[PDB]
Amino acid sequence: WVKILSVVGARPQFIKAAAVSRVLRASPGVREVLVHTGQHYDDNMSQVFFEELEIPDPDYHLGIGGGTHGQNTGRMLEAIEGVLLKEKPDWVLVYGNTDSTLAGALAAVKLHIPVAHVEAGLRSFNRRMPEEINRILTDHASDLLFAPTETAVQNLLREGIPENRIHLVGDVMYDAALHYGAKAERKSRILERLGLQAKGYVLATIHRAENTDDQERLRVILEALAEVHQEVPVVFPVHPRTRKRAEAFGLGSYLEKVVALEPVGYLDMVMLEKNARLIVTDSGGVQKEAYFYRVPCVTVREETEWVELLKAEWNYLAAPQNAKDLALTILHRMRTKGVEIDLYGDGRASQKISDFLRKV
Amino acid sequence: WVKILSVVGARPQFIKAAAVSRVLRASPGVREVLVHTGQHYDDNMSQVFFEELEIPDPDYHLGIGGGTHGQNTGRMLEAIEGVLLKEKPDWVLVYGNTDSTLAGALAAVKLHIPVAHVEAGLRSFNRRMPEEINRILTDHASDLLFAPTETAVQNLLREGIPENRIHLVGDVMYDAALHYGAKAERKSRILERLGLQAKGYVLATIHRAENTDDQERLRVILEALAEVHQEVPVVFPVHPRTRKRAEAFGLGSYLEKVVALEPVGYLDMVMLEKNARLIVTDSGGVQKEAYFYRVPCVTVREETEWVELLKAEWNYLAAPQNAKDLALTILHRMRTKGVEIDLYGDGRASQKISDFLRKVGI
Ligand SMILES: CC(=O)N[C@H]1[C@@H](OP(=O)(O)OP(=O)(O)OC[C@H]2O[C@@H](n3ccc(=O)[nH]c3=O)[C@H](O)[C@@H]2O)O[C@H](C(=O)O)[C@@H](O)[C@@H]1NC(C)=O
Numbered sequence: 249w250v251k252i253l254s255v256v257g258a259r260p261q262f263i264k265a266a267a268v269s270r271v272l273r274a275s276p277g278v279r280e281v282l283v284h285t286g287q288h289y290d291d292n293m294s295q296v297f298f299e300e301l302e303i304p305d306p307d308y309h310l311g312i313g314g315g316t317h318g319q320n321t322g323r324m325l326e327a328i329e330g331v332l333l334k335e336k337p338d339w340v341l342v343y344g345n346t347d348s349t350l351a352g353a354l355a356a357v358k359l360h361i362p363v364a365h366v367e368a369g370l371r372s373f374n375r376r377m378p379e380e381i382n383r384i385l386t387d388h389a390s391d392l393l394f395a396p397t398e399t400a401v402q403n404l405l406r407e408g409i410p411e412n413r414i415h416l417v418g419d420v421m422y423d424a425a426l427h428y429g430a431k432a433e434r435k436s437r438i439l440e441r442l443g444l445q446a447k448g449y450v451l452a453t454i455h456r457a458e459n460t461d462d463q464e465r466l467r468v469i470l471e472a473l474a475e476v477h478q479e480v481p482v483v484f485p486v487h488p489r490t491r492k493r494a495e496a497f498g499l500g501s502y503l504e505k506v507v508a509l510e511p512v513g514y515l516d517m518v519m520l521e522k523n524a525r526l527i528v529t530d531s532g533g534v535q536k537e538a539y540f541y542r543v544p545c546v547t548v549r550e551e552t553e554w555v556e557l558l559k560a561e562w563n564y565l566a567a568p569q570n571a572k573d574l575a576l577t578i579l580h581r582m583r584t585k586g587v588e589i590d591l592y593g594d595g596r597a598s599q600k601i602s603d604f605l606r607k608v
Numbered sequence: 609w610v611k612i613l614s615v616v617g618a619r620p621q622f623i624k625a626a627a628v629s630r631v632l633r634a635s636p637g638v639r640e641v642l643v644h645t646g647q648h649y650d651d652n653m654s655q656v657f658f659e660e661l662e663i664p665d666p667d668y669h670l671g672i673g674g675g676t677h678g679q680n681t682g683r684m685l686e687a688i689e690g691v692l693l694k695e696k697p698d699w700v701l702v703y704g705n706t707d708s709t710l711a712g713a714l715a716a717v718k719l720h721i722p723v724a725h726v727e728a729g730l731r732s733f734n735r736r737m738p739e740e741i742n743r744i745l746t747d748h749a750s751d752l753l754f755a756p757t758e759t760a761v762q763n764l765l766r767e768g769i770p771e772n773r774i775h776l777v778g779d780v781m782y783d784a785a786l787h788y789g790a791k792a793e794r795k796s797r798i799l800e801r802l803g804l805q806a807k808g809y810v811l812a813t814i815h816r817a818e819n820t821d822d823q824e825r826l827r828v829i830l831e832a833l834a835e836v837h838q839e840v841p842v843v844f845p846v847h848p849r850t851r852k853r854a855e856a857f858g859l860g861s862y863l864e865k866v867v868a869l870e871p872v873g874y875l876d877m878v879m880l881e882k883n884a885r886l887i888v889t890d891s892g893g894v895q896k897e898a899y900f901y902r903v904p905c906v907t908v909r910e911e912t913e914w915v916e917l918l919k920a921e922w923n924y925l926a927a928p929q930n931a932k933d934l935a936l937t938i939l940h941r942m943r944t945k946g947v948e949i950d951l952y953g954d955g956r957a958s959q960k961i962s963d964f965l966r967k968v969g970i
Pocket residue numbers: 258259260261263264343344345346349367370379421453485510511512513514515517518530531532533534537553
C-alpha cells in the first residue's frame with residue numbers, strides 16, 4: 249500500500265497524468281490521489297481532457313488560476329501544502345514545467361515528502377524564460393528524475409544531480425499517443441466538420457509568451473500563416489492567451505484569414521496532427537507528436553528542448569523575424585521528412601515509472 | 609542611477625544586511641529599498657537589530673510570519689512580487705537561506721529582475737533541512753552568487769553553475785563583527801548584569817527545527833546543558849521557537865538549571881561570545897563568530913555547512929544522541945584550540961559585493 253499524489257494544472261500535464269494514472273490505477277497496492285491546481289480552468293483547456301482521456305475526477309480542485317506568477321505560485325504553494333498535510337502521500341509526482349509543477353514540488357519537499365519529476369532534465373539554456381527556471385528549480389527540488397531523453401539525462405548530470413536519482417524512461421506523451429490513437433480514430437469527426445482532406449492542410453499552434461507578448465513576433469507569425477494559407481489551408485486551434493494577444497494588438501484579422509478554431513480536445517488534436525501535411529508550432533508536446541506521426545515539423549522558436557527532433561531532421565527551427573521568410577520556410581519544409589529512428593521509448597514509460605516508484 | 613532592493617526577514621539577515629547596506633549607502637548612483645518580510649517580529653529578534661546596527665527603517669513591512677513553510681513562503685511570494693512591481697528595482701539582494709530568501713528570489717526571477725545571493729553555495733547535503741532546499745533553489749535562481757568560502761564556490765561549480773556568476777567575496781558577518789566590535793565593547797553591560805567574568809562561562813544557542821521539533825533530541829540538549837552548568841555556568845539566550853517547543857513538551861524546568869535569557873541584541877551577543885570559555889550552538893552564524901574570537905566551538909548537529917571550521921579544529925560536531933556524552937564532549941572541548949588560519953576574508957566582503965552589483969552591466 250503506497251500513496252502516489254499527482255499535482256496537475258495545465259492541459260499538457262492532464263495528458264501526461266492520463267498515461268501515468270492508468271498504470272498506477274491498475275497497480276496492486278497503489279492508491280493515487282489527484283490534485284487539480286485550477287491553473288487551466290476552461291472546459292476546452294481542462295474538462296475535455298478528463299472526459300476523453302477517462303481521467304478519474306480529482307480528489308481536490310484548488311481553483312487557482314489567471315493571476316501573476318507570484319499569486320498563482322504563492323497560493324498553489326499554500327493550498328497544495330494544506331492537501332499534502334491531510335493526505336500524507338508517500339510520493340508526490342509533478343509534471344512538466346509550469347508554476348503548478350514548481351508549487352507542487354516545493355510544497356512537498358518542505359514536508360519531507362519524496363518528489364518525482366515526470367519529464368525531467370529538459371533545458372532551453374535560456375534562463376530568462378519562466379519555463380526554464382521552473383524546469384531547473386523543479387529538477388533541483390526533486391528526489392527522482394524521470395528523464396525522456398539522453399540529452400535530459402546529461403543535462404541533469406551536468407548540474408550535479410547523481411546518476412542514481414535519474415531514470416531514463418522515455419516520454420509518457422508517446423504512451424498517451426499510442427493508447428488513445430484508436431479512440432481518436434473512432435470518436436473524432438473534426439476533418440468532417442471542417443471539410444478537410446487527409447493531408448489537405450497544415451496544422452498550427454502558437455502560444456509561447458515570447459511569441460505572443462511581443463507584438464512584432466506575433467505579427468510575423470500571423471502574417472506568415474495567412475500567406476501559407478493562400479497555398480495550403482492552415483488549421484489553427486488558437487490558445488486563449490494567443491487569441492487575447494492578437495485581438496489586443498489589432499492582429500485579429502489574420503486569424504480570420506486562416507481556419508482558426510478554439511482549443512480542441514486531445515482526440516481531435518491527434519486526428520488533426522495525424523492527417524496534417526505539416527505542423528507549425530511553438531509547443532513542446534506538439535513537436536514530439538508531429539514526429540510520432542512522421543509529419544514534418546517547423547518550430548517557431550530560437551531553440552527547442554527536444555534537440556533530437558532537429559538532429560533526426562523531423563523538425564526545423566524558424567525564429568519569427570520575417571513574415572515572408574517564415575512563410576517560405578514552412579512551405580519548403582512540407583516536402584521534407586526525417587530519418588527512421590525510434591525516440592521516446594516503447595510506449596511503456598508510465599510502467600517504468602510505476603516500477604521505479606513502488607521499488608524506491 | 610541603480611535601485612537595489614534587499615529582502616530580509618530574520619535576525620541573521622538583518623545583521624548581514626546591516627553590513628552590506630552601510631557600503632551601498634556610501635556608493636554613488638545607488639538607491640536602496642529594504643523589504644522586511646515580517647518573518648521575525650518580536651523586538652528582541654528584529655527591532656533591536658535595526659536600532660543597534662544603524663539600519664534605516666524598512667521601506668516595506670509585509671508582516672508575514674508564524675505559519676507553515678507553505679503559508680509563510682506562499683504569502684511572502686505574492687506580497688514580495690507586489691512590492692517589486694511597484695519598485696521595479698534593478699537588483700534584488702537576498703541573504704542566507706530562510707523561507708524569506710527563497711520567496712524573494714522566486715518573486716524576482718519570474719519578473720526578470722536580477723537576483724544576487726549574499727552567502728551562496730553553502731551545502732549541508734541534508735535535504736530534510738528546509739534550509740538546504742532554500743539555498744539550492746535560491747542559488748539556482750540567482751544571477752550573482754556571493755560565496756563566502758572556497759567550499760561554497762566548489763559546491764556551486766559542481767551543480768552546473770558557471771564560474772562567471774560566482775564570486776568569492778568572503779563573509780559579510782565578519783565585516784559586521786569587525787565593524788561593530790568597538791561599539792559592543794563600549795555599550796554592552798551584559799557581563800556586569802549577569803555577574804559573569806571573562807572565560808567564566810559557556811555560551812549556548814539552540815534553534816534548529818531538527819533539534820527543537822523532536823522532544824527527545826531537545827531533552828538531550830537541555831539535559832546536557834544542565835549537566836555542563838554544574839561545572840561551568842551556561843548562558844543561554846533562548847530562541848522563541850525553542851522556548852515555545854520546550855514549554856509544549858513540558859521541558860521548561862530544564863531552562864531553570866542554566867542562565868536562560870530572552871534573545872539578546874548583537875552588541876550583547878558579541879560580548880558574550882567574545883568572553884566565553886566555549887560556545888555550543890546549532891546556529892550557522894554563531895559557529896563562525898566563535899572562530900572570530902578564537903573561542904572553541906561545539907556544533908550540536910549531524911553536520912555543518914562551515915566545514916573549514918572542523919578542519920582547523922575550531923569546531924566539533926556533537927549530534928544530540930545522549931545527554932551524558934554531549935555534556936562530556938562539551939566539557940572536553942572547552943580545553944581545545946584550533947589552528948591559526950584566516951577565513952572569511954578581509955572584512956570588506958560588502959565592498960566587493962557593492963562593486964560587483966555596480967559593474968556587472970546591462
Ligand atoms: C516550452 C515548454 O516549456 N513547454 C511546456 C508546456 O507544454 P506545451 O508547450 O506542450 O504546452 P501545450 O501545447 O499546451 O501542450 C501540448 C499538448 O496539448 C495538446 N493540445 C494542444 C492544442 C490543442 O488545441 N489541443 C490539444 O489537445 C497537444 O496534443 C499536446 O499533447 O508545459 C508542459 C507541462 O508543464 O506539462 C511541459 O512539459 C512543456 N515542456 C517542454 C520542455 O516541452
